[PDB]
């Protein structure tokens, strides 16, 4: 198949991302600025270390760091990944967002469910 993640993904500065040393307050502020609620989380090496959702952070202390509330990130894709395979897993496992990473697991951005389903 010719349709890959590269053609559909959203770079991290467009979609949004959090640092593991950011706080729950920073997450709530990003939700209102970006109108999205699920973000990849990176460490100081730019490596994806988790994902943060409203289920993870909504009821937490605003002062708490993201590394202490974030969820595990197991589904990761690359630029060459087939969109058909991504859609199959997003449907079967009910994902809204999947982080896009380089071979060294550093963050490039995300693919969203609406973009995958519409294309």
- 48 binds Cl ion, rule: CB under 5 A: no
What is the torsional sign of CA 51, 52, 56, 62?
A: positive
Restricting to residues 27-46, name those near Cl ion by CB under 5 A: 38
- 17 binds Cl ion, rule: CB under 5 A: no
Distance (Å, rounded) from C-alpha 28 to C-alpha 64? 12
Restricting to residues 30-69, name those near Na ion by CB under 5 A: 34-36
Out of 42, 52, 66, 97, the only residue in the binding site for Cl ion (CB under 5 A) is 97
Distance (Å, rounded) from C-alpha 8 to C-alpha 85? 14
65 HSE (CA, 13 A, CB side): 8
- 96 binds Cl ion, rule: CB under 5 A: yes
Tell me, by CB under 5 A, how many residues bind Na ion. Answer: 3
Contact 8, 111 (CB under 8 A): yes
* Residue 34 binding result from Na ion, Cl ion, none, given CB thresholds of 5 to 8 Å by partner type: Na ion
Binding site for Cl ion (CB under 5 A): 38, 95-97
């Amino acid at each position: 198949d010719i349709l890959t993640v590269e053609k559909l993904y959203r770079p991290s500065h467009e979609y949004g991302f959090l640092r593991e040393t950011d706080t729950v307050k920073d997450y709530l502020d990003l939700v209102r600025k970006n109108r999205s609620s699920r973000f990849p989380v990176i460490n100081q090496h730019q490596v994806v270390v988790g994902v943060v959702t409203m289920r993870d952070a909504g009821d937490k202390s605003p002062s708490t760091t993201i590394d202490k509330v974030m969820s595990r990130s197991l589904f990761l894709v690359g630029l060459s990944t087939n969109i058909a395979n991504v859609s199959q897993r997003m449907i079967a496992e009910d994902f809204e967002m999947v982080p896009v990473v380089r071979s060294n697991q550093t963050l490039l951005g995300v693919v969203t469910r609406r973009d995958v389903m519409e294309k």
